[PDB]
Amino acid sequence: GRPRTTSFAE
Amino acid sequence: RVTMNEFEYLKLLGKGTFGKVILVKEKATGRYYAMKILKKEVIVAKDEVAHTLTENRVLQNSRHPFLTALKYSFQTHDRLCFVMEYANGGELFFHLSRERVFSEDRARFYGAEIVSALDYLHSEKNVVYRDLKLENLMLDKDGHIKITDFGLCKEGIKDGATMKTFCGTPEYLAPEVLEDNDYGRAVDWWGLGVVMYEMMCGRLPFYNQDHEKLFELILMEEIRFPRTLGPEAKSLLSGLLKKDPKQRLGGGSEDAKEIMQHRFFAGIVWQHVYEKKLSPPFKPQVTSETDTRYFDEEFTAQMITRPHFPQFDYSASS
Ligand SMILES: CCOCCN(C[C@@H](O)CN1CCC[C@@]2(CCc3c(ccc4[nH]ncc34)O2)C1)S(=O)(=O)c1c(C)cccc1C
């Protein structure tokens, strides 16, 4: 299903 | 205790912007581990230093059946290395990329183990995890959950204490975080809700490729419920995906205790969950110690090739 996601912080 | 040369480098498990994870064997013990190898220059360049040190502390300080265990940390001139227990089952993301939907029983089993782990993080460690997602959830050789990737954790967070950092994974961000409000530990139950939704429904509850459209859905749209979903599953998902954290299941003083009591979990003896006395729904089917069938061929088919991080180096004891 969905593409791999990416963790982040601002 | 250890260096780069105490290990054999067998199979690439994954690779990203910050480095790679390699299935390794400890020369002295014959034991297999997963070594996360991060590029110091990238970590510095992306301002990831405090996250890496946070992941290190949280891993060191935690002991739980459903949290990934750390054996060694050390560093080189240009590298940071975490030697963690190897989870031959890969990511939940791997499995849901192939199955599409788990049964309610199977989703309940993983959900109970995740609750067990987050309850421990909140209650015992005063930690809020903040990055629950299919990619950060692994299965060990017996089919039990292992949470990974503690770099986004908030430490020293008690009961209702609040947090400010805009962080996590866009698809999984809770409404109160998108509202630019101070938020508490109930963000973790939102993340549990999105993961349970994905497991039982086979899609994210909110999705657009565009982040602004995605964030709008999260803030504005009620969740849809596939007609296959039973009433207690619907109720659980509905309660975990309450947009107001004060109304969310687990959003009060009792935290995880409120989720544990929910009728979706009616079969479940929580002490048996912790003691791992409940039969896993899936046991990874491996033919050897080095069978990496639950990691993407894209990675496993590949051949293997400035500052001091203070107080990073570590070796486990008991
Ligand atoms: C402080 C910021 O660094 C962190 C940012 N990265 C995030 C990754 O850690 C995501 N993880 C999510 C869970 C699975 C991975 C790979 C397999 C694995 C572990 C952890 C413990 C394990 N035990 N057994 C296997 C195993 O990590 C990658 S990454 O994006 O660079 C990256 C990706 C996508 C893929 C592979 C390696 C890396 C480093």
Enumerate residues 6+ apart whose C-beta is below 8 A from B188.
B118, B121, B122, B128, B129, B130, B132, B250
Strand partners, B130: none
Fold match flag (B1-90+286-312 vs B91-285): no
B131 among known catalytic residues:
yes
Rounded to whole angstroms, the Cα distance separating B196 from B104 reads 9
Binding-site entries of B for ATP? 13-21, 36
User: Residue B132 and residue B94: Cα distance in Å, rounded?
Assistant: 15
Host H or E run for residue A9: strand A8-9
| B183 neighbors B245 (Cβ within 8 angstroms) | yes
CA B178 to chain centre: 21
For B233: left if phi > 0, alpha if psi spans -120 to 50, otherwise beta; the answer is alpha
Delimit the domains of chain B by residue range. 1-90+286-312, 91-285
Backbone angles phi, psi at B220, to 5 degrees: -110, -35
- Report which residue type is found at B235: S
Q: Give B32's contacts (C-beta < 8 A, 6+ positions apart).
A: B10, B23, B24, B25, B26, B86, B289, B290
CATH class of segment(s) B1-90+286-312: alpha beta
- What lies within 8 Å, CB to CB, of B310 at 6+ separation is none
- Determine the CATH number of domain B91-285: 1.10.510.10
Q: Which of B131, B140, B149, B255 is catalytic?
A: B131
Pick A1's closest partner by Cβ from B96, B165, B172.
B96
Distance B290 CA to ligand 1 centre (A): 18
Is B289:B31 a contact under the CB 8 Å cutoff? no
d(CA B86, CA B318): 18
